[PDB]
Design a protein around this ligand. Structure first.
Ligand code: ADP
Ligand code: ADP
Ligand code: ADP
Ligand code: MG
Ligand code: MG
Lengths: 52, 46, 106, 72, 52, 525, 52, 75, 151
């Protein structure tokens, strides 16, 4: 149920990271996910290489 | 002997490392030969 | 460890003397604290040899079967009489088969 | 190699093996209509399978343990 | 439906595997530079330029 | 005897020559290689290609268009050159059908090779193919339907054709959204056939579904220093004047004086001339000024003093697009303010797309010019999206010009081939065999379409042939689940012009290639 | 996935579905922020700079 | 795998190389520190001689290749 | 991943490897070339070939025999080598039928190439050919006529 549980490097273990003040904007993870998935689909829709 | 349209395809993209390795030395010599061309036979005879 | 002292101009003879003294003390300490059993019990010597063989073997690709090979090695060695000549223990390598298929011939 | 879908056929055969205790259910390569290899008389020696597994495991371990290459 | 379609060419599979291997190699290259405990990389281009 | 196989040599060094069987073998090999390469990129389930350039920069290109694949390769087989140029011309005529025509020509030439191996003279094959082409063209023309009279039916046909065109390309992931976008963009042309009026801007970053058709117009230029960045109820003047150190066009003129005071006077006179020109421009009562050429510092400052936007260096395409979208007149003289028309739009402002800034023309007057913003994760994805959108726009424009439509999915090819077979079995001689080979190639086209999807192409093609022979003239390949369906209900439609051009070009190229019995090559340079 | 015998088109559509579900999950996991909350901006900048 | 046209050093190898370069630069000028230090003769393969004790001058005249040694020279 | 299209190189200098479609293409090209070479020497109106030797002897040999033609040629395509050995063994077993067997094998392989192009697994083709060979053998045996009794 711990929604904000993350890797803690200061204590070398695992704990809540909001108390460690480790936050990032949503439009970093969301953008990375969307771009990576779309690039993966584009790569998957490929079956040949041609040299000019 | 058919299939003359080889279309080497995947071949180069896996060997362009070695191709460029040879091409770099070829070009490196090429500057030397091109430079010495303007003197070695450009006006030697005349 | 002695490189930093070498770089700063320490005379190497001092380093050599320190090494000799430390090594002599360490060898004497090893001889003093080494554990030995004064009973010559056949079971105890068997177990000691097996444990030493297991410790020696537990770093190689046959470490999974280290108990099997250790027992086999102890059995092989004990049947040498007094000289423990290596040429009296033949080793044959036959391709194909699991490691456990290896056997000791009496 | 027989043209069938690998994942689907394998999953179905494994599910059938789990359902009824019958380790003879395999891949119907010849399309005889049944997966029962005992009924299809597909028989292999136990020693062969044991040697296959043992040799593969030992060589995989040996390859995994190598971490340095020193070709000239 | 039985045997089904037979993959005659098999070169598209090789192309896809090559693309996947290249992408995975690139990720493993830039894999150790991630997170607070990630180190930097030094790149020397064809010229004498150096960037860390 | 022969030129090459003669006791004396009649050629220069490096010259070559190939007789009947050898030239035929070379031509057929080249054509089949081209057809095999281009195919597998045909139909909804066709995959793309990677075009890795061998040049210094080594440009990378991921594409599905047959014309772009064929033009960006090193082709040395002359028959392959003929096929490549046929594909290029097909692309020039209409935006879609390059892969189809290439594959049809390749299959026709394969059947021709088989017939030649069966000891049939090439002229017999040519005559049979001419008859088959006539029959197929007549059948296709009789199978066409027209919905240009009905507005809603025409709109639905346009939507279906755009969807069918975009089905094969990478945009099939958002086919519905991109089909609506392309249909609206083409409809905004108000019947004009110019695709240059539709600008496509490729901006990196963002999802492919983030692409949109702008309700107004977007310009990638910049405003002057002291000019407003936002105006309301714009009154736009589009100009094509110098506005840059404007020199009197008397080329032989020069300044010859005897004192620097006179030089200063002449300099002030030039500045006053430029100021008077700016005053004449402002006499039109404008808010935004768009010039095709550069605007230098003094005119820009003068415009800023009057509070007038001055967009500079908008090229010929830019000024044409602004004139189309706002209704202005591209002027070059400002002595008759009452004889010029000023463009109007509701609002002009600067918008942020990605990390760049663009000028947004919103609430335009006419709007007969579109800008489409394309967003993608890679430059290759953006390029392929632009190419696919160009194909869709070309096909939609052709359908707007000629509203006749035919059903795709192999229905048109199957009915063509059925008519060809009906003609073939009624004709005696080996011309019947040639026509049967023609019908076989026409069958092979949807066969390749089904193979690309991994379906049972033989069974599906047999079912299609049976349906078309019985009388079901609308049966085709339903690729949703791999069965046959009615293309009328399924909404799979293709332009009649595209299909007719594909058929005729393929027949023409096959005929010209088949006639060749000797290839002679000059010494390469 | 490909070695198991899955066509590289079911994979693309499945990846798209997973991407949509993941965007929904990330959106549900996010927290609203206002630019007047200087502490959150400082934390975001510090998190960005932690790895450099 | 990477197919990058060049060399790659990773882990302890590159760190040891950097430390070696820095140590070589330090040992170049370590002998010219303190009053009992001594100057150096520098010849530029044309016949020009620069007798100097300044560390900055010595590191400036020398032509260096490794990036870490260059970092120390600029320092 | 393929043995040749892999980031690592697993072969000695000069070693080669052709996968499914490339190997099938090479085999079919070799077989068709051999079949088209040996044919036109078949039937009552078949013609002869001239076999010029490239060696020091440069022996001249004009012949109509298929086995003789296939023996004295430089063959590097391994499938062509298989067909040549088939022809040689056929000549050893019985005097005639070398050209017929070579042409039949070439035509069968051409049909196999067409079937493979039609997306049919080669094992299905092999099973069908086994059944067809059984049927053809039975029919040919039934069609035989024996006249050993009457002199
Ligand atoms: N102090 C920290 N403790 C734990 N994780 C962190 C910390 N700082 C950054 N991260 C994590 O490191 C990840 C990678 O960020 P970074 O290494 O800067 O490169 P990039 O942002 O380009 O991935 C982020 O997803 C972030 O969650
Ligand atoms: N959704 C679809 N269903 C059935 N057939 C289609 C569909 N989309 C395209 N096709 C068919 O694929 C063929 C090739 O179209 P496409 O690959 O888009 O362009 P090109 O004609 O340049 O190859 C067309 O003849 C068309 O009949
Ligand atoms: N007089 C003939 N009429 C019709 N066919 C013939 C005649 N003579 C031979 N043939 C056919 O020619 C074929 C090839 O025979 P030939 O070329 O002599 O030897 P091989 O069987 O080695 O090719 C045989 O299958 C035979 O049926
Ligand atoms: Mg040890
Ligand atoms: Mg298309």
């Amino acid at each position: 149920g711990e929604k904000t549980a993350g890797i803690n490097v200061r204590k070398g273990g695992i704990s809540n990271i909001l108390e460690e003040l480790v936050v990032q904007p949503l439009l970093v993870s969301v953008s990375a996910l969307t771009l990576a998935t779309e690039t993966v689909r584009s790569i998957l829709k490929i079956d040949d290489v041609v040299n000019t | 002997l058919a299939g003359e349209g080889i279309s080497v395809n995947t071949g180069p993209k896996g060997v362009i490392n070695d191709w460029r390795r040879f091409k770099q030395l070829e070009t490196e010599q090429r500057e030397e030969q091109c430079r010495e061309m303007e003197r070695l036979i450009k006006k030697l005879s005349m | 460890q002695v490189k930093p002292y070498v770089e700063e101009g320490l005379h190497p003879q001092i380093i050599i003397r320190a090494f000799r003294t430390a090594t002599q003390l360490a060898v004497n300490k090893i001889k003093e604290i080494a554990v030995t059993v004064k009973k010559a019990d056949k079971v105890e010597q068997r177990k000691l040899l097996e444990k030493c063989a297991m410790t020696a073997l537990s770093s190689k690709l046959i470490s999974q079967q280290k108990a099997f090979f250790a027992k086999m090695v102890v059995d092989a060695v004990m049947m040498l009489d007094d000289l423990l000549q290596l040429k009296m223990i033949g080793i044959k390598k036959v391709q194909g088969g699991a490691l456990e298929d290896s056997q000791l011939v009496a | 190699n027989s043209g069938m879908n690998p994942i689907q056929t394998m999953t179905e055969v494994r599910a059938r093996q789990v359902k009824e205790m019958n380790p003879a259910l395999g891949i119907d390569c010849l399309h005889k209509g049944t997966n029962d290899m005992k009924q299809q008389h597909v028989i292999e020696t136990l020693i062969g399978k044991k040697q296959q597994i043992s040799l593969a495991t030992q060589m995989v371990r040996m390859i995994l343990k190598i971490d340095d290459i020193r070709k000239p | 439906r039985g045997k089904g379609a037979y993959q005659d060419r098999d070169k598209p599979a090789q192309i896809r595997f090559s693309n996947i291997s290249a992408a995975k190699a690139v990720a493993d290259a830039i894999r150790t530079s991630l997170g607070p405990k990630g180190m930097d990389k030094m790149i020397q281009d064809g010229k004498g330029d150096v960037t860390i | 005897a022969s030129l090459s196989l003669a006791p004396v040599n009649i050629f220069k060094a490096g010259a070559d020559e190939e007789r009947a069987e050898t030239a035929r073998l070379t031509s057929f090999i080249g054509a089949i290689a081209i057809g095999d390469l281009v195919k597998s990129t045909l139909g909804p389930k066709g995959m793309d290609k990677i075009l890795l350039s061998s040049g210094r920069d080594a440009s990378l290109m991921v594409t599905n268009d047959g014309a772009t694949i064929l033009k960006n390769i090193g082709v040395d087989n002359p028959a392959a050159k003929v096929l490549v140029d046929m594909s290029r011309v097909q692309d020039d005529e209409v935006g879609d059908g390059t892969t189809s025509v290439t594959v049809l020509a390749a299959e026709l030439l394969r059947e021709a090779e088989s017939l030649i191996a069966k000891k049939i003279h090439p002229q017999t094959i040519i005559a049979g193919w001419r008859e088959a082409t006539k029959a197929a063209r007549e059948a296709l023309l009789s199978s066409a339907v027209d919905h240009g009279s009905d507005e809603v039916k025409f709109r639905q046909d346009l939507m279906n054709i755009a969807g069918t065109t975009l089905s094969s390309k990478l945009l099939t992931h958002h086919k519905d959204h991109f089909t609506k976008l392309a249909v609206e963009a083409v409809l905004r042309l108000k019947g004009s056939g110019n695709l240059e009026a539709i600008h496509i801007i490729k901006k990196l970053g963002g999802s492919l579904a983030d692409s949109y058709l702008d309700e107004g117009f977007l310009l990638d230029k910049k405003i002057g220093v002291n000019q407003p960045k936002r105006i309301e109820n714009a009154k736009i003047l589009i100009a094509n004047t110098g506005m840059d150190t404007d020199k009197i066009k008397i080329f032989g003129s020069r300044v010859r004086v005897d004192s620097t005071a006179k030089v200063a006077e002449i300099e002030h006179a030039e500045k006053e001339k430029m100021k008077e020109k700016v005053e004449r421009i402002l006499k039109h009562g404008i808010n935004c000024f768009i010039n095709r050429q550069l605007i230098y510092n003094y005119p820009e400052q003068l415009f800023g003093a009057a509070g007038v936007m001055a967009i500079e260096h908008a090229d010929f395409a830019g000024v044409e697009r602004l004139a189309l979208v706002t209704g202005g007149e591209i002027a070059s003289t400002f002595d008759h303010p009452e004889l010029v028309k000023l463009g109007s739009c509701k609002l002009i402002e600067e918008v942020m797309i990605g990390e760049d800034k663009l000028i947004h023309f919103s609430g335009v007057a006419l709007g007969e010019a579109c800008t489409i913003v394309l967003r993608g994760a890679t430059q290759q994805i953006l390029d392929e999206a632009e190419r696919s959108l160009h194909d869709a726009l070309c096909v939609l424009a052709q359908t707007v010009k000629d509203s006749r439509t035919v059903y795709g999915g192999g229905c048109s090819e199957m009915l063509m081939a059925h008519a060809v077979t009906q003609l073939a079995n009624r004709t005696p001689g080996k011309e019947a065999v040639a026509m049967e080979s023609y019908a076989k190639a026409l069958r092979m086209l949807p066969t390749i379409i089904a193979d690309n999807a991994g379906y049972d192409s033989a069974d599906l093609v047999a079912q299609l042939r049976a349906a078309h022979s019985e009388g079901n003239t609308t049966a085709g390949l339903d690729m949703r689940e791999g069965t046959i369906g009615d293309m009328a209900i399924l909404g799979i439609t293709e332009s009649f012009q595209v299909k007719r051009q594909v058929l005729l070009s393929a027949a023409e190229a096959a005929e010209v290639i088949l006639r060749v019995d000797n290839i002679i090559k000059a010494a390469p340079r | 996935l490909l070695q198991k015998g899955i066509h590289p088109t079911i994979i693309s559509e499945s990846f798209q579905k997973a991407l949509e579900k993941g965007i929904e999950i990330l959106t549900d996991m996010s927290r609203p922020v206002e630019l007047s909350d200087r502490e959150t901006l400082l934390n975001s900048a510090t998190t960005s700079l932690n790895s450099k | 795998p990477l197919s990058v046209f060049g060399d790659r050093s990773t882990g302890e190898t590159i760190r040891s190389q950097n430390v070696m370069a820095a140590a070589s630069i330090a040992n170049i000028v370590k002998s010219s520190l303190g009053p009992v230090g001594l100057d150096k003769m520098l010849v530029d393969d044309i016949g020009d001689v620069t007798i100097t004790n300044d560390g900055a001058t010595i590191l400036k005249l020398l032509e260096v290749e490794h990036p870490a040694a260059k970092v120390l020279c600029e320092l």
